[PDB]
Amino acid sequence: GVPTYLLPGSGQFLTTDDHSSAPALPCFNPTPEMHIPGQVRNMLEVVQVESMMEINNTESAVGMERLKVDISALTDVDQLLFNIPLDIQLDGPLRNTLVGNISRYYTHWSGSLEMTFMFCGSFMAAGKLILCYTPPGGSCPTTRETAMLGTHIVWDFGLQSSVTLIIPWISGSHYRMFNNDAKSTNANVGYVTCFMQTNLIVPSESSDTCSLIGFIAAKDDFSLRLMRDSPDIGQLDHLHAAEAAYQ
Amino acid sequence: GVPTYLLPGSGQFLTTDDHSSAPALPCFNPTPEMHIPGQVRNMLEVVQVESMMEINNTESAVGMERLKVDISALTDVDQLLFNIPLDIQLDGPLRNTLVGNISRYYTHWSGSLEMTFMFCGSFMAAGKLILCYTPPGGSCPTTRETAMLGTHIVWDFGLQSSVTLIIPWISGSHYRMFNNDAKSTNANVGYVTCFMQTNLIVPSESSDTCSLIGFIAAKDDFSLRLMRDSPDIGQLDHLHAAEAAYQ
Amino acid sequence: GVPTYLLPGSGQFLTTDDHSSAPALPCFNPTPEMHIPGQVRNMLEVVQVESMMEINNTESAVGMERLKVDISALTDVDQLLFNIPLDIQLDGPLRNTLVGNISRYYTHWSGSLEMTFMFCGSFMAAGKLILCYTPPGGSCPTTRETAMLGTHIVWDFGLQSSVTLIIPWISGSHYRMFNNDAKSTNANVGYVTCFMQTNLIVPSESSDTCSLIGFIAAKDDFSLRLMRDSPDIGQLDHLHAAEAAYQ
Amino acid sequence: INFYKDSYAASASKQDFSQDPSKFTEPVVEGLKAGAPVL
Amino acid sequence: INFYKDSYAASASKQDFSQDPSKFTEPVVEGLKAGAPVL
Amino acid sequence: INFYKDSYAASASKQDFSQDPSKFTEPVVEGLKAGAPVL
Amino acid sequence: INFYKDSYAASASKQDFSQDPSKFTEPVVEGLKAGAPVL
Amino acid sequence: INFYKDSYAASASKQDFSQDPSKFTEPVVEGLKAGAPVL
Amino acid sequence: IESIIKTATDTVKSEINAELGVVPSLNAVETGATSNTEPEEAIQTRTVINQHGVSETLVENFLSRAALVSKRSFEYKDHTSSTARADKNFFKWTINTRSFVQLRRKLELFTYLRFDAEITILTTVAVNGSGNNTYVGLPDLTLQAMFVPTGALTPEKQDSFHWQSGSNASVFFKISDPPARITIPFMCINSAYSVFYDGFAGFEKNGLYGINPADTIGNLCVRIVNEHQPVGFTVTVRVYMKPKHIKAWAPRPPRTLPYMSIANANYKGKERAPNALSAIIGNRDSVKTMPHNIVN
């Protein structure tokens, strides 16, 4: 015979191992493959699809009210309208999105994100907004004159109802980490703020309050590493009817 | 199947074994390599770097005082100034050096060493010294007329502030051993002594006491074998905060 | 994976097995080889070297007295002088020789042996002897007329001080056995006897008693098989200072 | 290492790097051009 | 013997004998010559 | 079968049949001839 | 993987796809033609 | 499969089909012919 | 200049030297360069063909050795009346290489390190003798080691539903088996681990000093899969780590004073030499005293 010796790790069951195993049903012929639309081969294809952010995650907002931000005409200039925390690991507006949900199965991430906002006011409504991304290091800007020093896009409402703010990958390290310390230098991405650029101006017959819907997605420079169990789902007991499977 | 039989040693865990093992994270992509200065591929590169000897390892010397040897003008000729034990395994002036620290992770050594001394007196100070290496066999020489029979360099202070004494590899055996018996024929290297050649002569305004700094390094004929745990570090209890890792 | 099954003998420790095993010290560089005189690659080279027989193994002989045989002038003709048992396994004159010592590590042997005798009398001493080898089957011859029927050499003392008696390999079987039954047909080699051929004749000033030294060695047709533990060494307790190794 | 006779016994296949994200990001009959207004 | 699909699973690599001690022994802009005074 | 990286891990070497018994049986400067008297 | 010396020790043979159902479905001397009445 | 260095360690040899029954059935100097009387 | 070095350098024979303007034995330490004096220039040498290998001092060989990094003992029993601090049939460990000094000192000989880590887990069991000082035999238990990365939830009890390990890598091994082994890849978010980090981990001023957040690994969670037996046992788990495929940069002065904490490089030194704060090397009577002088 062949002389052999067993290495450390022999006989172990590693859940991520990759080996062939004995076929339980010899000569079984699986059903022939048939073309089905919508095949996905890499999860990065899913995170590239836009999904709505829950910007209005406040106690006053119920159901889909949390998925839109209301803006009204103001009588003071350069007023802040809203900001968006950029932490995917923490429970924030980006968590329940395609990019957020898929990414929270991993520990490291890199690449640019894009935020798209659709103005859903009446045709007669007009206004200009400035959307700013502030790289980390300081406090979230509270005034337009400070926020406009960072990356920003000035958005003019019009026939094209939607604008895109690119959050470029600006990082010292190759990857960032989805870690619970939101203030860590390996995790913090910065802030996104939205200020009035001129004002929301509508005629008397239009609604005086208009809504924006914010979307987020990753660009094709996005990548993820270090698979982990998602903290978005858990169970403390057996589900109903699970016991019946053994009856 | 393949007939096999298990050899002695099967199932053992040898800390120095070299085998492939199951990847815990399939398809993980490590961060791309980036050029970093100061790459080291062989520890012999480190031992070739000069480091200071603790020649003045006496109770009167505190802190970095132990890293310099003071020399003053003498009124008798041919006087001994200092000697240096050449045992790396024992606790001596060579132990806390790059060569000594790295070598004490090994058991056998071979090759030439070099001692470099820098004179740190004033520009106006003058003098000549003789540095001698005595191969083993007898007592450390106590007089210049005996020490000068061995390998030596006569050093004249001047614009070039430093001289090098080569300790050539003179050994019956291919290697020596870092063994606690300092008088063993497999370990003893001999002695290094320093005598006044003429005198330290300084003017009245210069300091009447001048310091030398001794450095040691191995030449590129140096080699080490038989890795061992260094006796230079140990612990009798868990370090502080080590328990907190399990909390 | 590879389907396998374990054979009988798997996991056993056979002291004569021949396998590779894990190197305990990776990347260790052994000391370079150096030419040393007297290399031996086959133990048969040692048994080919002459060594002295203990022919005079009698209670009256002490120390090296047992390594020489004294012969004196006789007043009767054709007298027997000595005989030599040819059994290596039993405790006899051939046991403490190079050939005997090496062979007693084995069980089977074959090939010719040679006995050489050196006459150590004075230059003025003269004499002739007959050395006979009797193949087995009967009693050891006690008279010259019977001993001379076998293989023999008539030795004339002279300038060449030594004669060689060849004991040719005369055996029914390919090998003989070193077995404790000295009378077995698989072990008995026969006898060697020495008779006066004429007489030892010396002048009055020479010693009237002269000594012979007998040597034995194997020829290059000698071979051995079936390694065994030598019965020439043993211990009933631990040697002195053996316990100290564990202190 | 697969000595089994049935192909489905083999180890995992992690070498399919083909992608087509436009199936989900741009499932429109009229493809959009860079810079030009969509509407 | 490495039948694993991920390269980092392989055994150790002890075959890199490249050295450059001058990075630590002679990190000076002006290289020094043998015998000639340094200063 | 030796898959170890260090050569000294290999099994025994029992193939060195070279001999020179004259090193011990005839270490004399003047070689002796067959039949001719040694002295 | 069969290192045994006797051939009957080998694993199963599942590669004989030859068929002849007519031995049981049409064991008549006169073969029947499609469409044409049998009788 | 024999990785042992000594040849006698090998498995059994069952391939010697040579026969000579006449050594025991017809060990006579004069061979006998078919049909012809032996005596 | 970079070159391939496999053996120690040879020596060339040298003759008498008397040359004006040439002083190879003189050097200028002030430049920061180590002396370039050769043996052939200091003494008269012979020719020597040096065959001494240098492979055992390769960084890979120097560091690629399995070393203890974690040792945890916990009681395997019914933990219904156990304190909140007790390991109730499982433990979690925040992975670090700073708890055992032998490996820590060798790692801290370098500033930056890049390597994959081979992890070996060794388990031993002993019957509890407290009150029940009777021996019945050692059970062959099954254990689960789960790697919980940053941001993932760690199990809170032996039967926690977190052990289902949908995506976490888990290894199930038995005490009777050879020690479990897996390879963890280089998982730093940078190109190399920062053995030393002269910085703070957060954008505020209260973050931990001396620990690079880029090198955060995660938690190793180990439980006994078997439900508790009628009697109690003590289970000891030892974790060994062997770096491999190593790259190292910027060597550093070795640690001299004893380590105090795994969180910092705080130092106190021994009460007296050797390795005291004011005297690293042991004392001798004077600079002219030979400690081990050979007399006759």
Ligand SMILES: Cc1cc(-c2noc(C(F)(F)F)n2)ccc1OCCCc1cc(C(=O)N(C)C)no1
């Ligand atoms: C010890 C250990 C165990 C596991 C594990 N145990 O079980 C499993 C499971 F679940 F798959 F089975 N995974 C995983 C990873 C581990 O450590 C990684 C070592 C990396 C490193 C960084 C530094 C550093 O910061 N430097 C050098 C400055 N040092 O080393």
